[PDB]
Coordinates of C-alpha atoms in Angstrom, one line a residue:
Chain A
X1 CA 5.2 -180.8 1.4
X2 CA 5.2 -177.3 0.2
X3 CA 3.0 -176.9 3.3
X4 CA 5.8 -178.5 5.4
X5 CA 8.3 -176.0 3.9
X6 CA 5.9 -173.0 4.6
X7 CA 5.5 -174.1 8.2
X8 CA 9.2 -174.2 8.6
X9 CA 9.5 -170.7 7.1
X10 CA 6.9 -169.3 9.5
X11 CA 8.3 -171.0 12.5
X12 CA 11.8 -169.8 11.8
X13 CA 10.6 -166.2 11.2
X14 CA 8.5 -166.1 14.5
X15 CA 11.7 -167.0 16.5
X16 CA 13.5 -163.8 15.6
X17 CA 13.4 -161.0 18.1
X18 CA 11.1 -158.2 17.0
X19 CA 8.8 -160.3 14.8
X20 CA 5.0 -159.8 15.5
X21 CA 3.9 -162.6 13.4
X22 CA 4.1 -163.5 9.7
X23 CA 1.5 -161.4 7.9
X24 CA 2.0 -162.8 4.5
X25 CA 4.1 -165.6 2.9
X26 CA 4.2 -166.5 -0.8
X27 CA 6.5 -169.4 -1.7
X28 CA 7.1 -171.2 -5.0
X29 CA 9.4 -173.7 -6.5
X30 CA 11.8 -172.8 -9.3
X31 CA 13.0 -176.2 -10.0
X32 CA 14.1 -177.7 -6.7
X33 CA 14.7 -174.3 -5.2
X34 CA 12.3 -172.1 -3.2
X35 CA 11.8 -168.4 -4.0
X36 CA 9.7 -166.6 -1.4
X37 CA 8.4 -163.2 -0.3
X38 CA 7.1 -162.4 3.1
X39 CA 5.8 -159.6 5.3
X40 CA 6.4 -159.6 9.0
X41 CA 4.6 -157.6 11.7
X42 CA 6.7 -155.2 13.8
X43 CA 6.1 -152.7 16.7
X44 CA 4.7 -149.5 15.2
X45 CA 7.1 -147.6 17.6
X46 CA 10.2 -149.3 16.2
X47 CA 12.2 -147.0 13.9
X48 CA 12.4 -147.7 10.2
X49 CA 16.1 -148.7 10.7
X50 CA 15.1 -151.2 13.5
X51 CA 12.5 -152.7 11.2
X52 CA 15.1 -153.1 8.5
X53 CA 17.4 -154.9 10.9
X54 CA 14.6 -157.3 11.9
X55 CA 13.8 -158.1 8.3
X56 CA 17.5 -158.8 7.7
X57 CA 17.6 -161.0 10.8
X58 CA 14.6 -162.9 9.5
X59 CA 16.2 -163.4 6.1
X60 CA 19.3 -164.8 7.8
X61 CA 17.4 -167.1 10.2
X62 CA 15.1 -168.5 7.5
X63 CA 17.7 -169.1 4.9
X64 CA 20.0 -170.6 7.5
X65 CA 17.3 -173.1 8.6
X66 CA 15.8 -174.0 5.2
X67 CA 18.6 -174.7 2.8
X68 CA 16.4 -175.0 -0.4
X69 CA 15.5 -171.3 -0.3
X70 CA 17.5 -169.4 -2.9
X71 CA 15.6 -166.1 -2.9
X72 CA 13.8 -164.5 0.1
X73 CA 12.4 -161.0 0.4
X74 CA 11.2 -159.8 3.7
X75 CA 9.3 -156.5 4.3
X76 CA 7.6 -155.2 7.5
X77 CA 4.3 -153.7 8.5
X78 CA 3.1 -152.1 11.8
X79 CA 1.2 -154.6 13.9
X80 CA -0.3 -154.1 17.4
Chain B
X1 CA 2.7 -138.2 -22.0
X2 CA 3.1 -141.1 -19.7
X3 CA 6.4 -139.2 -18.9
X4 CA 4.3 -136.1 -18.2
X5 CA 2.1 -138.1 -15.8
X6 CA 5.1 -139.7 -14.1
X7 CA 6.7 -136.3 -13.6
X8 CA 3.5 -135.0 -12.0
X9 CA 3.4 -138.1 -9.6
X10 CA 7.0 -137.6 -8.5
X11 CA 6.6 -133.8 -8.0
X12 CA 3.4 -134.3 -6.0
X13 CA 5.1 -137.0 -3.8
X14 CA 8.2 -134.8 -3.2
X15 CA 6.0 -132.0 -1.8
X16 CA 4.7 -134.1 1.2
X17 CA 6.5 -133.5 4.5
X18 CA 8.8 -136.5 5.4
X19 CA 9.5 -137.7 1.8
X20 CA 13.2 -138.2 1.1
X21 CA 12.7 -138.7 -2.6
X22 CA 10.9 -141.1 -4.8
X23 CA 13.0 -144.3 -4.9
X24 CA 10.8 -146.2 -7.4
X25 CA 7.7 -145.5 -9.5
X26 CA 6.0 -148.0 -11.8
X27 CA 2.9 -146.6 -13.6
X28 CA 0.7 -148.2 -16.2
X29 CA -2.5 -147.5 -18.0
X30 CA -5.6 -149.7 -17.5
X31 CA -7.7 -148.2 -20.1
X32 CA -7.7 -144.4 -19.5
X33 CA -6.9 -144.9 -15.8
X34 CA -3.4 -145.1 -14.2
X35 CA -2.5 -147.8 -11.7
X36 CA 0.8 -147.1 -10.0
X37 CA 3.1 -148.4 -7.2
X38 CA 5.9 -146.4 -5.7
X39 CA 8.5 -146.4 -3.0
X40 CA 9.4 -143.3 -1.1
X41 CA 12.5 -142.6 1.0
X42 CA 12.1 -141.7 4.7
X43 CA 14.3 -140.8 7.7
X44 CA 15.6 -144.1 9.2
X45 CA 14.9 -142.7 12.6
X46 CA 11.2 -142.1 11.9
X47 CA 9.0 -144.8 13.5
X48 CA 7.2 -147.4 11.4
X49 CA 4.0 -145.6 12.3
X50 CA 5.3 -142.3 11.1
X51 CA 6.4 -143.9 7.9
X52 CA 2.9 -145.3 7.4
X53 CA 1.5 -141.8 7.9
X54 CA 3.8 -140.3 5.3
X55 CA 2.9 -143.0 2.8
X56 CA -0.8 -142.3 3.4
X57 CA -0.2 -138.6 3.0
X58 CA 1.6 -139.2 -0.3
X59 CA -1.3 -141.4 -1.5
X60 CA -3.8 -138.6 -0.7
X61 CA -1.5 -135.8 -2.3
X62 CA -0.9 -137.7 -5.5
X63 CA -4.4 -138.9 -6.1
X64 CA -5.8 -135.5 -5.3
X65 CA -3.5 -133.8 -7.9
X66 CA -3.6 -136.5 -10.6
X67 CA -7.2 -137.4 -11.1
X68 CA -6.7 -140.2 -13.6
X69 CA -5.0 -142.4 -10.9
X70 CA -7.4 -145.1 -9.8
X71 CA -5.0 -147.3 -7.8
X72 CA -1.8 -146.1 -6.0
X73 CA 0.3 -148.2 -3.6
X74 CA 3.0 -146.4 -1.6
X75 CA 5.7 -148.1 0.5
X76 CA 8.7 -146.6 2.3
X77 CA 12.4 -147.4 2.7
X78 CA 15.2 -145.8 4.8
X79 CA 17.1 -143.2 3.0
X80 CA 20.0 -141.0 4.4

């Protein structure tokens, strides 16, 4: 339900080039809308700029696929 | 007072190689202890691993200089 929506968020994030898994996802309803914050893994040898580009790509992929999301923050952490 | 402690935190962070300013600092007292979270700027062309190393260096510099800090989280963002 919410679990259904979280699964969709993870799946959509994992399909973006450069994502090394979803490390963390917190999602909540504000009325009928979802507000979420997530942390993605990235290659430690990517540049900070590349990691920012991946996060922005995730934000666009996820919000394009899951139309109820009205706020999404995406950060990155090194992951082997 | 608290302003004195914040100034010390910023100064100590700015003295670590690789810091391109303090972007954000939130500090609060939990009893006599300080708990703080901060965001440092870094070179967009540093690797994610390098940025992690800078953040860890900041955590060590700051907590070494300001002994009342009992919790400090340090994250990075690209800054030109």
